[PDB]
Design a binder for these strands. Structure first.
Lengths: 226, 223, 214, 224
RNA sequence: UUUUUUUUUUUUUUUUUUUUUUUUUUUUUUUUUUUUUUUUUU
C-alpha cells in the first residue's frame, strides 16, 4: 500500500504490562477458563499465520468460544502500527493468559491440578519441561511471559539466555526481555541486585533436559550411526 | 467454517487408522478404474499436486488423475494442516501409499504385469538416487511417499531409504517420526526394531550400494 | 556516454511542483518509510506510482520493479532515490536560513541510516543529512559527507565497493569529479577524519550486563 | 488443477547442430547485426516479460523481426515438452551466438562490424571485450555451451570461474557438463580434450572481473 | 531435454546500509498405525 503516515514517537514506553494485564482481566476475566486458554496455546502459531496473511489492522479472534479483539501487527505492512496501551496483540494476550493461569494456580492445589490436566505449552515440552517442573517454569515458556519476570520467577529471562547459548537463537529476541522490569525496579537494578535469584533460576533451567528426543529405541537408529 | 474461530477440541492419543483397512476401502471404491496409466500419471504429477493443493481452500479438493476422479481430503492448506481425517479417506500421501501397494501386489502375482509396470510407471524419487526397476519392485516402489504404511509389503525399504536420507542428505531426523511408529504386519515398532534387525540391516546395505551425490557421470579436474 | 541529468535543475523543478506542500513532518515520514516504500515499488508492476507521505502525494517513477530497472527516467522526473536527495537538500537549505527551523528540523526529522552509526543532529546538519540516499547529488551542500561516509562503509562494513560508482562521478558545484578529487583533496580528507570520530559503527542495549556468557 | 497425462520419456542431447540449422532455415535471411545487437541488450528483460504471461508460445520482436518462441519461463510451463527444432529464449541466444561466430572467422570486415554493433553485457561485466577474441566474447552468451567446439571450451570454463569467483550454484553447470565437443561425448572430452580446457581456463583467468576511472588513483589514495 | 544465476556504456538507472520505548515485528510450537513440513527422473 502506497500511503505512509506518522507515527509520532518518543523515548520511554508508556506501556506498563501490569496495568495492561489488569485491563485485560477487566474486559475478559469473567469469560476465561482453562479450556479457553488450552485452545489459545495450541492454536497460537496458527492464529499468527492467519494474522500474517490478513489485511485488517485489527481482528476478532475466537478461542474456545470466547471472542477477543486483537491488534494485527503481523501483516508486513502493519509491523510499525502503534498499539494502544490497553490493547492486546497475540503476543500480549499470550503473556496475559499465562499470567492469569499462574495467578489461578498459585492460589489452590485444585486449580493447579486441573490446569495441569487441560493446558499444554508446546514450547516448554520440546525442551523437556512438563507441569512437573512447577507452574512458573512451564508457563514461563509462553510468549509474552517475559513481561512478568516477578510472577514467573525470572524463568523467561534465563530461558532466553539458554536459547542463545544451546540453540543458536539470533542474539536479538533478547532485546525485549533485557529492558523489562522486575516487580519493584528497572533492569539495571535487578540485573545485579537480584543476580543471586537469577543465577539460581538460570541453574534451575540449566538442569532441564536438552531435550532433543523421541523414545527408546532411539536404541535402533544409533545402531545405524544415528 | 471460519479461519478466525478456533476450537476446542480434543486430545489426541492413539491412532485408529489401519492402512490395511484403508487400502481395501480404497480398492473397493476406485479399484475398477485403476490401471498403470492412471498410476503413471499420479506419480509424475505428485509434487505438483502437493503444490496446488497447498494453495487451495476447500477441505476436500477433487482431483482427477489420468482421467480418473478421486475424492481427496486436503490437509496441505496450511490451516487445514491439522483437521480430522477419517480412517477411510485419502490425503495425497495415503493415495500414493495406496497405488504403490496396488502396483506391488499386481506385480507380485504376474511376471508379465511386472514388465508392463516396468515400462510405464516412473518413480522420480527413486530415479534421482539411481534406483531402477532392475533393483527390484519392492525397493523401487519403496521410494513412493506413503509406502512406509506397508513395511511388510516393501520389505522395510521405505524405512532404510529414510535412514540413508538422514545420513547422506541432511534430512531432519524428525521426518522419520511416522515410519518409526508404523507396523510390520501385526508387530508394533517396538517389536520389529528388535526382532527384525537382520532383515532391516540387509535392506540397509543394499540401499547403501546405490548411486548418489549430484548429477555426476565421472566428473574431475576438481570436483 | 554523457549524463544529461543535472540534479540542480531537477531540484528546482521538484520544488516548483511540490514545494508549496512540503514541511518537516512530510520529510519526517518519508525518511522513516523510505525502506518500506522501496519494497512496495519493487513488487508493483506500474512504471509510475503515486505515493503519499505525510498526506502529500508524489508521482514517482518505478524502476525498482525488476523489469523496469533500465527504463529511461526523464530529467525532471522523480524516483525515490532522487526525492530523498531533494528532500534532504531542502531541509539543509531551510536550516541555513535560520538556526530556528534548524531547531524544528532537529526535533522532527530522523535519519535511521545516520543513527546506527553514532551520528546525530548534534554532529551538525550537513553530516547528519549527508547519510540520506541521494545526498551525494549535492556534495557542495553537504560538505562532501555523503562521499566520505561510504568510504567508511567500504572498509567498516564490507560494502561491495562499486556502489561507490555514482558518488565518484558527481559534481562539486561546477567543479567536475576529475577536478575536485584533486583540487578539493584536502577538505575531503578532512571530512573523512571527522566521521572517523563517530561510533565507528556499532552493542545496542548493554554492555550493561548479560555477560554471564555472551 | 486438472490432472493430466504423461509428457515424455527421455532426451539425448536434442542435437543443437540440427536445431541451429533449422533455425537458420526459418529466420536465417532476415538476420543482421542490428537485430542481433538488440537481442543481446534485451535478453534479460525478455525473460522477465516471458514469466508473467500465460501463453506457451509467444511472438517476440527484435530489431523489427518476429520470432516464434516456446515459453517455459512462466512457472507452470517450466516442464513442458520442447520440440527438437523449436526455440526457447536460451536456444535462440545460443543460435544467434553461433551465428556471428560463423560470420566472423569467415571474414575480416564482418569481424569489424560485429564488434561495433554487438554488445555482450555478460562478457563486459568480466572486463572481457571483442579485443580478447570473438570466441571468448561470444562464449559469454547463454546457449553458447551448446556449441563447445565453436567457442573453444570457453562457456565451460567461464562457468568454472563463476563457481570459483562468484558464488554460483554449480548445479547451473549440470547442462554444460553433459554437452558435446565436436563428435566427442562429455565423458570423452573431460580426459581426451584437456590441455585445451586448461588453456581456456587460464586464458579467461587472465581477464579482469569488471573495473571505473583511475581514480582508481584516489580510492587507492585512501584504501583501494 | 527444460527451467532457475550472471546482463555493457552516463552528473541515467538498479542492487547494499534503515532511530527511538516496560512499543512493535522476525525464532522456538504437545500428543497418535492421525496430519503437515524435506526429497521428484533423460
Amino acid at each position: 500500500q502506497f500511503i505512509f503516515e506518522d507515527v509520532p514517537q518518543r523515548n520511554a514506553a508508556t506501556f506498563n504490562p501490569e496495568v495492561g494485564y489488569v485491563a485485560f482481566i477487566g474486559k475478559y476475566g469473567q469469560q476465561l477458563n482453562f479450556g479457553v486458554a488450552r485452545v489459545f496455546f495450541l492454536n497460537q502459531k496458527k492464529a499468527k499465520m492467519v494474522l500474517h496473511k490478513t489485511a485488517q489492522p485489527s481482528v476478532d479472534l475466537t478461542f474456545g468460544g470466547v471472542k477477543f479483539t486483537v491488534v494485527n501487527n503481523h501483516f508486513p505492512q502493519y509491523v510499525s502500527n502503534p498499539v494502544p496501551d490497553n490493547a492486546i496483540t497475540l503476543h500480549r494476550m499470550s503473556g496475559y493468559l499465562a499470567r492469569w493461569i499462574a495467578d489461578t494456580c498459585k492460589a489452590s492445589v485444585l486449580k493447579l491440578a486441573e490446569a495441569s490436566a487441560q493446558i499444554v505449552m508446546p514450547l516448554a515440552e520440546v525442551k523437556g519441561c512438563t507441569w512437573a517442573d512447577g507452574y512458573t517454569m512451564y508457563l514461563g515458556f509462553a510468549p509474552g511471559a517475559e513481561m512478568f519476570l516477578d510472577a514467573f520467577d525470572f524463568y523467561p529471562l534465563v530461558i532466553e539466555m539458554h536459547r542463545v547459548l544451546k540453540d543458536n537463537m539470533d542474539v536479538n529476541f533478547m532485546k525485549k526481555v533485557l529492558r523489562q522490569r522486575y516487580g519493584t525496579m528497572t533492569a539495571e537494578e535487578w540485573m545485579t541486585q537480584k543476580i543471586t535469584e537469577i543465577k539460581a533460576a538460570f541453574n534451575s533451567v540449566g538442569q532441564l533436559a536438552w531435550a532433543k528426543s523421541g523414545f527408546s529405541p532411539a536404541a535402533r537408529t544409533f545402531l545405524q550411526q544415528f
